[PDB]
């Protein structure tokens, strides 16, 4: 088994407050729903937002969502807020080693 | 109810060739199910060590991990310039698979 590569796009984006943010990840192997989305702010650890492709982690605002199963996944922020400025990552958990996408750095326009 | 990983130190500085020692404590027994990731500046975290002590492909021999249960150590035997990064432990005994807070390593 080759390590699973997660292809995340875009690498950076800017948008305005309220805008819809759309990030994609494609897994190099079928990973079912074993895909998480994390938010990382400077100097902090990744924080789990979406687990098992589409489940909202406790305490996380509902503007955050995920979809997909198999190889193609999408993460959405339906209305971008100032506090959401961070780098986001997809990560797969189907098989060790757990692998991250390359990240998407968000900024406000 | 999520397992708390207490990683220390938060940051350190050391010299090329020095021994770097990072610890993680789990709030409950996680057997051997501990990962160590390296996150180089601007990059995603990359898994170096799994099952507490097993090295991934291409990880050089200066990296090691030890411990079981609640008490774990990550060691760089001889720090190299390319090792400057933030390191994270992660338990994968019980979902969610929670992370330590990180250790930011710099050169003196």
UniProtKB/Swiss-Prot annotation, chain A:
Region Framework-3: list its residue ranges. Answer: 59-90
- Record keywords: Cell membrane included? yes
Region (Framework-1), start-end ranges:
3-25
Q: List the cysteine pairs that form cystine.
A: 25-90
Ranges where the Ig-like domain occurs? 4-97
Q: Name one GO biological process term.
A: immune response
Q: Where is this region: Complementarity-determining-3?
A: 91-97
Q: Name one GO molecular function term.
A: identical protein binding
Renumbered to this chain, region (Framework-2) spans 37-51
Tell me yes or no: is Transmembrane among this UniProt entry's keywords.
no
Q: Where in the cell is it found?
A: Secreted; Cell membrane
Give the start-end ranges of region Complementarity-determining-1.
26-36
Region annotation (Complementarity-determining-2) maps to 52-58
Its biological purpose is as follows: V region of the variable domain of immunoglobulin light chains that participates in the antigen recognition. Immunoglobulins, also known as antibodies, are membrane-bound or secreted glycoproteins produced by B lymphocytes. In the recognition phase of humoral immunity, the membrane-bound immunoglobulins serve as receptors which, upon binding of a specific antigen, trigger the clonal expansion and differentiation of B lymphocytes into immunoglobulins-secreting plasma cells.
Name of this protein:
Immunoglobulin kappa variable 1-33
């Amino acid at each position: 088994s080759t390590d699973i590569q997660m292809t995340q796009s875009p690498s950076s984006l800017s948008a305005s407050v309220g805008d819809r943010v759309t990030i994609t990840c494609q897994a190099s192997q079928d990973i079912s729903n074993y895909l998480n989305w994390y938010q990382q702010k400077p100097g902090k650890a990744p924080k789990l937002l979406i687990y098992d492709a589409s489940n909202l982690e406790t305490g996380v605002p509902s503007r955050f969502s995920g979809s997909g199963s198999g190889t193609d996944f999408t993460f959405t922020i339906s209305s971008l807020q100032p506090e959401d400025i961070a780098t986001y990552y997809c990560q797969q958990y189907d098989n060790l080693p757990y692998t991250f996408g390359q990240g998407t750095k968000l900024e406000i326009k």
